[PDB]
Structure 1
Amino acid sequence: SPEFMENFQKVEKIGEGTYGVVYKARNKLTGEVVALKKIRLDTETEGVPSTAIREISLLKELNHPNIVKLLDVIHTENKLYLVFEFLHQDLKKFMDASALTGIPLPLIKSYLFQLLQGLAFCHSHRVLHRDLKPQNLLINTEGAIKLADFGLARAFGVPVRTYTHEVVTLWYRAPEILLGCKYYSTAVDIWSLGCIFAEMVTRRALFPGDSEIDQLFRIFRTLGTPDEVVWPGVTSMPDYKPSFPKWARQDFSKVVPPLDEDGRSLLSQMLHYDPNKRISAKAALAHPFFQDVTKPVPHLRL
């Protein structure tokens, strides 16, 4: 039974994603709360490009406990509304609410483990998220965390220039992308997740840059400016410049003080410069850091 936008009551804005504001809404019929993503279509040059639709088809096929569920799609004139299951909060809001004490370690471990399961599934299904950030990681009352707001390799609808997409995205962007690499791999998601892991532990973003070059310099200042020994081929990457400052590597003992050797070991493998040495989602699940992983329920307040 087709739904119509007149069947949904706006409740409040709950997020700012790649396509603008995300609304919490209530289906006037069932009384069910949902999340709405609006996409403005620009049927100009030729209409909707098959290419973009292909990526979306793969996303549509995804079915996993750690990937937000799409409940319905609503088409209008030049618009597209996606009706999603509503989850309590996103990771950014949760961290902001827990910044005075920080997220308990078992929860950090549980969320990272679940995100790795979600990514392992995506990567084995030809799907990369590409824009991982705390804001698009959704947590529910039952302790689950889910991936949402996937980035497409190909632009789909009309772009939405927000701080989140133009700037925040940069903070979690893999160095090979910043250096203009030809074709990147699923490893770019592992980098993003590694940055998020660090952030959950320190309660502060690891590399908050405001431009690609500033982002790159912030990364070099902490992990050290990469070289051919550490990352074979780095000096020949499209945007690499011999004139980049040469910073020495800082110890994770200083970068993420609270973590023990198992945590640092995992983090180091996720933030490896060489995409070829960066741990895979599947391999990460077997890391000893998750030896005592459980399924705790969070302390959500609003």
Structure 2
Amino acid sequence: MENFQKVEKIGEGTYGVVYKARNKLTGEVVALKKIRLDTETEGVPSTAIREISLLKELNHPNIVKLLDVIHTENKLYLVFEFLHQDLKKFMDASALTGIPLPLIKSYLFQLLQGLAFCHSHRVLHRDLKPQNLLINTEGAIKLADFGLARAFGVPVRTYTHEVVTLWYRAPEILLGCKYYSTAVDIWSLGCIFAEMVTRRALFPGDSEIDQLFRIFRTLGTPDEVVWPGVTSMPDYKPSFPKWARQDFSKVVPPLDEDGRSLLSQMLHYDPNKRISAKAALAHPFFQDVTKPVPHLRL
């Protein structure tokens, strides 16, 4: 765009390149995202424009602010508030010592607040992953790209030919449910929570079926007792191997009883039984939550 001076390429997201750019008028550094490469023949649907415009109104201190929407030359650029680091980078940087529990608890608490806010307005993210969880020097964490999947139906091989991670995908999505709920976001967060604690991805599948079988090997193959209606799901197959559920004490050491209790509720098979963001904020796990300052050198 021309009202901005790019100052860097922050990377390549799901929808296009993300640049660090300086707004020439204001002088504020912002995150500029050019949307959808190649696949955009129509002239940018009025429908995505309308969904996006709605997001401009969704403001919360734990939601990365959508500053502007620029449909120029029949192209779309979303201007977001800029944050210096994402959680993926931070975790890689805390690989040897781990992220302290107090920090983990504060980050989870703030994430659940942003989520409860979006969920109350019937807005879903549906593509939560460490990469779109941004952190700053004050101890805050914010959810990036909330509601965009609804605007632009999420693909796997990006314009950069990159393969979209399935590691945080909820089982109802993997089994073909097309009317997914706010529960999908809680499943993803449960997975990110377990990853922060153990310093290893919970379910690093490399194909849809590998993703699903890794979930089954750990949580047990779902049946009609734990998930009523599972066997009627589109991609459900009577030929799925039947695996037993493992003990969470073995899955997420050394998380204490409160954390494991919370995690198991975030990881319920049945989307309807899964804990909501709102109820999770009330869990005993957060009784001693604080807001500590992270360790980052930019």
TM-score by length of 1: 0.91
* Partner secondary structure for residue 166 of structure 1: coil
Alpha-carbon distance in 1 for matches of 2:24, 2:5: 6
**1:73, 1:57 → 2: CA distance?**
8
Question: 1:43/1:210 Cα in 2 relative to 1: closer, same or farther (>3 Å)?
Answer: closer
Range moving further from structure 2, 222-231 or 128-137 = 222-231
Q: 1:49 Cα shift? A: 2.9
Taking the aligned partners of 1:112 and 1:164, their CA distance within structure 2 comes to 31
2:140 aligned residue: 144
Q: Choose from 50, 54, 57 the match for 2:46.
A: 50
Instruction: Give the secondary structure class of the aligned counterpart of 2:164.
Output: helix
Q: 1:164 to 1:300 in 2, by over 3 A?
A: farther
Query: Is the CA contact (8 Å cut-off) linking 1:70 and 1:85 kept in structure 2?
Result: yes
In structure 2, relative to structure 1, the CA distance for the partners of 1:74 and 1:58 (3 Å cut) is closer
Structure 1 37/77 Cα, relative in aligned 2: closer, same or farther at 3 Å? same
Preserved contact between residue 15 and residue 159 of structure 2 (Cα < 8 Å): no
> Unaligned regions of 5+ residues in structure 1, if any?
none
Q: Which deviates further from its counterpart, 13-22 or 278-287?
A: 13-22
- Residue equivalent to 1:281: 277
Structure 1 pair 172/164, CA: closer, same or farther in 2 (3 Å)?
farther
The percent identity for this pair of structures is 100
More displaced stretch, 118-127 vs 16-25: 16-25
8 Å Cα contact 2:125-2:149 kept in structure 1: no
Q: Which moved more, 1:244-253 or 1:65-74?
A: 65-74
Q: 1:212 to 1:117 in 2, by over 3 A?
A: same
Does the CA contact (< 8 Å) of 2:9 and 2:20 recur in 1? Answer: yes
Paired position in structure 2 for 1:212: 208
- Distance in 2, matches of 1:154 and 1:227, equals 30
Whether the 8 Å CA contact 2:55–2:147 is kept in 1: the answer is no
Alignment check: 8 A CA contact 1:131 1:151 kept: no
Once residues 282 and 201 of structure 1 are traced to their aligned partners in structure 2, the CA distance between those partners, rounded to angstroms, is: 22
**Cα pair distance change 1:122/1:154, threshold 3 Å:** closer
Give the C-alpha shift of residue 52 in structure 1. Answer: 2.7
More displaced, 273-282 or 168-177? 168-177
Kindly state the Cα deviation for residue 182 of structure 1 after the two structures are TM-superposed: 3.9
How far did 1:165 drift? 9.5
Residues 238-268 of structure 1, C-alpha deviations (whole Å, 9 max, x = no match): 1100101111111111111020000000000
Find the counterpart in structure 1 of residue 286 from structure 2.
Answer: 290
Q: Are residues 1:109 and 2:95 paired?
A: no
User: How much has 1:163 moved relative to structure 2?
Assistant: 9.5
For 2:32, what is the secondary structure of its paired residue? strand
Classify 1:43/1:165 alpha carbon distance in 2 versus 1 (closer, same or farther; 3 Å): closer
CA offset digits 1:16-70 (Å, max 9, x no partner): 3211221112234554322111115889875433433343233222011111112
Greater shift, 98-107 or 66-75, is seen at 66-75
Q: Is the 8 A contact 1:68 1:148 kept in 2?
A: yes
Structural RMSD (CA)? 2.4
CA distance change for structure 1 residues 116 and 21 in 2, over 3 Å: closer, same or farther? same
Query: Are 1:69 and 2:65 matched, yes or no?
Result: yes
Distance in 2 between the 1:267 and 1:159 partners?
28
Moved more, 164-173 or 220-229: 164-173
- Cα offset, 1:181, TM superposition: 1.5
Is the Cα–Cα contact under 8 Å of residues 14 and 22 in structure 1 kept in the other structure?
yes
Per the alignment, do residues 169 and 253 of structure 1 end up closer, same or farther by CA in structure 2, a change over 3 Å counting? same
The structure-2 alpha-carbon separation of the partners of 1:214 and 1:60, relative to structure 1 and needing over 3 Å to count, comes to same
Using the size of structure 2 for normalisation, the TM-score is 0.92
Cα deviation 1:78-124 (Å, max 9, x = unaligned): 32222211112011111111111111111110111111000101010
State the distance in 1 between where 2:236 and 2:76 align. 40
Runs of 5+ unmatched residues, structure 2: none
| Inter-CA distance 241–163: structure 2 relative to 1 (3 Å threshold) | farther
